[PDB]
Amino acid sequence: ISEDRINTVRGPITISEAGFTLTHEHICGSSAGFLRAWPEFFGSRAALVEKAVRGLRRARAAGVRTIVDVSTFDAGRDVSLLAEVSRAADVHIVAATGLWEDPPLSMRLRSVEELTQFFLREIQYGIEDTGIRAGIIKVATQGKATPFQELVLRAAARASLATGVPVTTHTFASQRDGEQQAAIFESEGLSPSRVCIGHSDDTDDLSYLTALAARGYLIGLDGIPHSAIGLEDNASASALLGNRSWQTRALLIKALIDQGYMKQILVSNDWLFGFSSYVTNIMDVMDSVNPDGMAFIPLRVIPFLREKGVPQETLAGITVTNPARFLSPT
Amino acid sequence: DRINTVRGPITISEAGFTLTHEHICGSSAGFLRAWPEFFGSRAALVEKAVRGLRRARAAGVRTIVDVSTFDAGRDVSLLAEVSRAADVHIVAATGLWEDPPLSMRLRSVEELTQFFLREIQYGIEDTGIRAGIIKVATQGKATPFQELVLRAAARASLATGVPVTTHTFASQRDGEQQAAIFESEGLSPSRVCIGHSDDTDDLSYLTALAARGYLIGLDGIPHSAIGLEDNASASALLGNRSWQTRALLIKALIDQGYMKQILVSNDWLFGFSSYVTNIMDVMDSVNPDGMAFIPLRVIPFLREKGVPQETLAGITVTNPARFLSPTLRAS
Numbered sequence: 130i131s132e133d134r135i136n137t138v139r140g141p142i143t144i145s146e147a148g149f150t151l152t153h154e155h156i157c158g159s160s161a162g163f164l165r166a167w168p169e170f171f172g173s174r175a176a177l178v179e180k181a182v183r184g185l186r187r188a189r190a191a192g193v194r195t196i197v198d199v200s201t202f203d204a205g206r207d208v209s210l211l212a213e214v215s216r217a218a219d220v221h222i223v224a225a226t227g228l229w230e231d232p233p234l235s236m237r238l239r240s241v242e243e244l245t246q247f248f249l250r251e252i253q254y255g256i257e258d259t260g261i262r263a264g265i266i267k268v269a270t271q272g273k274a275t276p277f278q279e280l281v282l283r284a285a286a287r288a289s290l291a292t293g294v295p296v297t298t299h300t301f302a303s304q305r306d307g308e309q310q311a312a313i314f315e316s317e318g319l320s321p322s323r324v325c326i327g328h329s330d331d332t333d334d335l336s337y338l339t340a341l342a343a344r345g346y347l348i349g350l351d352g353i354p355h356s357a358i359g360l361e362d363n364a365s366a367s368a369l370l371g372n373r374s375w376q377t378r379a380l381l382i383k384a385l386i387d388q389g390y391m392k393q394i395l396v397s398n399d400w401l402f403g404f405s406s407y408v409t410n411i412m413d414v415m416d417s418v419n420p421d422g423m424a425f426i427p428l429r430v431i432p433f434l435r436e437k438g439v440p441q442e443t444l445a446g447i448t449v450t451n452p453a454r455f456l457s458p459t
Numbered sequence: 460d461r462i463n464t465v466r467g468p469i470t471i472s473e474a475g476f477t478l479t480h481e482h483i484c485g486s487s488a489g490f491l492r493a494w495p496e497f498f499g500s501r502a503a504l505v506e507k508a509v510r511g512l513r514r515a516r517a518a519g520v521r522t523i524v525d526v527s528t529f530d531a532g533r534d535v536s537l538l539a540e541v542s543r544a545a546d547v548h549i550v551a552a553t554g555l556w557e558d559p560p561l562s563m564r565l566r567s568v569e570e571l572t573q574f575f576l577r578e579i580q581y582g583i584e585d586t587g588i589r590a591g592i593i594k595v596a597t598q599g600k601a602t603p604f605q606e607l608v609l610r611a612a613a614r615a616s617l618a619t620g621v622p623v624t625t626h627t628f629a630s631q632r633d634g635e636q637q638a639a640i641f642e643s644e645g646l647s648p649s650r651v652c653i654g655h656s657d658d659t660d661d662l663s664y665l666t667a668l669a670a671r672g673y674l675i676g677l678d679g680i681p682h683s684a685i686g687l688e689d690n691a692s693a694s695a696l697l698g699n700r701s702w703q704t705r706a707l708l709i710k711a712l713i714d715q716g717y718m719k720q721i722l723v724s725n726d727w728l729f730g731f732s733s734y735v736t737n738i739m740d741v742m743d744s745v746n747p748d749g750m751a752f753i754p755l756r757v758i759p760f761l762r763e764k765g766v767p768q769e770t771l772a773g774i775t776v777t778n779p780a781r782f783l784s785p786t787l788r789a790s
């Protein structure tokens with residue numbers, strides 16, 4: 130004698146309970162404190178809850194059982210909101226720590242050691258006074274890392290090594306940010322199998338993606354429905370969503386399957402039910418081109434890949450097996 | 460007639476000796492709640508703030524204006540707790556300071572006006588506490604977004620009657636552009652305090668604004684890194700001008716006839732996360748009196764320089780009362 134679980138906003142769950150998992154989503158993309166200070170920007174807090182519950186229930190009916198909400202502190206993560214909508218839609222939600230693209234002064238001024246302590250607090254102790262523990266660490270670059278972003282990448286690697294929770298990233302994929310992120314992570318001793326290089330469907334450079342995957346990284350093809358096709362007269366929507374079709378993004382899933390990387394693909398929508406960190410109309414514009422919301426992956430992408438010949442066992446591997454392996458702490 | 464505080468409305472007469480530019484905790488939105496251990500704990504910050512407010516109260520202070528905005532990490536529930544425990548009135552602020560997040564930076568002048576009106580007319584967050592002042596900031600020539608903030612502040616002030624108070628880079632004469640923008644919106648100068656005005660020695664700049672009816676915020680009197688020359692971060696923040704140099708600007712404005720335009724404060728805090736990690740400890744070593752520095756140090760200094768007590772009472776009691784009392788709403 131003397132010689133299994135993932136944290137969600139409702140508490141620990143076993144691996145088997147996660148099921149079909151969307152690995153990069155947002156209940157509400159905002160800013161720290163903003164939902165509490167100005168809920169009327171979203172109509173009301175109650176209206177945002179109702180919208181998220183409706184959308185999550187639709188995703189659940191399409192087969193989704195878990196989402197990973199990769200909103201950080203500076204993306205306005207409100208874990209109490211996540212917990213309310215998770216409960217009322219009966220969909221598990223994994224919450225995130227880390228930092229995204231808009232850290233305030235009180236974060237931007239901190240050392241790598243301080244950031245490590247903050248990420249560890251959110252994983253090991255809880256987020257705010259809620260007792261809800263993060264189950265993933267989110268980081269971001271937008272091209273070459275700023276000095277602070279390098280600190281965040283290192284603190285994320287250290288927090289991952291101390292807890293076993295994985296790291297997921299925002300990239301400027303066309304600037305191959307995953308390469309710099311990988312270099313910094315490996316300089317900290319982090320295993321590539323603990324890292325998802327996200328927004329990787331924003332590029333068509335397959336050689337960039339297969340080289341990362343041949344190093345063991347997971348590849349996040351996570352913005353499949355993001356497209357401004359049909360919105361060409363809308364500059365702000367076009368700038369955010371791009372002019373590449375959802376089908377072009379979905380073809381990358383098949384391409385990576387065909388190149389042997391099915392065990393390293395993670396798929397998602399990068400959808401939201403509220404969105405205050407961009408132009409005012411953006412949520413309504415996005416909803417007008419993708420009414421399916423987070424159900425877009427199961428309702429549209431799965432049939433598209435099935436028509437292309439991808440067998441169901443491969444699709445189950447990508448949507449069930451891969452997220453469970455990634456999220457289970459090492 | 461009544462001034463909104465974190466404990467509800469108070470009569471103008473209850474405000475008493477008022478410090479018009481202070482902070483319980485200078486932070487970032489959501490930060491105190493997400494990482495209270497940065498301050499030791501929330502409980503430690505409460506105890507420190509209550510002790511510091513009691514020290515100010517024993518020295519005669521009865522009200523402070525906490526000019527922390529949303530993006531400076533204002534936690535009005537913290538303000539209410541410490542105000543009640545220390546029995547010092549606290550007026551809370553709306554507006555935006557120097558660190559707005561994307562969800563604010565992307566907003567139009569109309570949207571910002573709505574947000575400021577929400578915090579004044581409805582309440583801050585879900586607390587029911589209404590803001591009694593609007594805080595805005597520039598650090599040099601205004602950015603396009605800062606111009607929107609100045610205009611929204613003017614519009615919210617005209618609609619509600621609550622005054623406007625500003626952060627300036629005083630040595631770059633920011634108050635002149637702020638005044639121009641406020642006046643283009645029809646805002647009365649007597650409802651505007653041009654803050655951090657003690658950061659400059661240019662009396663011609665200060666007296667010209669005062670002559671136009673602007674209030675002059677000499678609000679950082681104890682900020683000095685004299686003796687801390689080997690500390691670059693403290694030197695950059697606090698400057699190398701003495702508290703006596705800053706205090707003598709109060710006398711200079713009095714001597715030139717502008718007593719009625721003066722407001723005085725410490726610009727102190729009990730927690731501070733938006734700068735380098737040890738700053739609050741360093742500031743506390745410089746000024747253990749905290750917010751009591753104005754009454755315990757500046758008043759006796761000016762008294763012995765010949766400023767009558769009744770003049771100092773007018774500056775610390777009557778001037779803030781006139782500033783904070785809301786004007787009639789437009790229409």
Ligand SMILES: C[C@@H]1C[C@@H](O)OC(C)(C)O1
Nearest residue numbers: 155158159204369399400
């Ligand atoms: C809050 C999220 C972050 C990242 O996923 O980008 C989008 C535009 C989807 O907003």
Ligand SMILES: [Zn+2]
Nearest residue numbers: 298299300328
């Ligand atoms: Zn992203």
Ligand SMILES: [Zn+2]
Nearest residue numbers: 153155199399
């Ligand atoms: Zn995202």
Ligand SMILES: [Zn+2]
Nearest residue numbers: 625626627655
């Ligand atoms: Zn200031």
Ligand SMILES: [Zn+2]
Nearest residue numbers: 481482526726
């Ligand atoms: Zn201040």
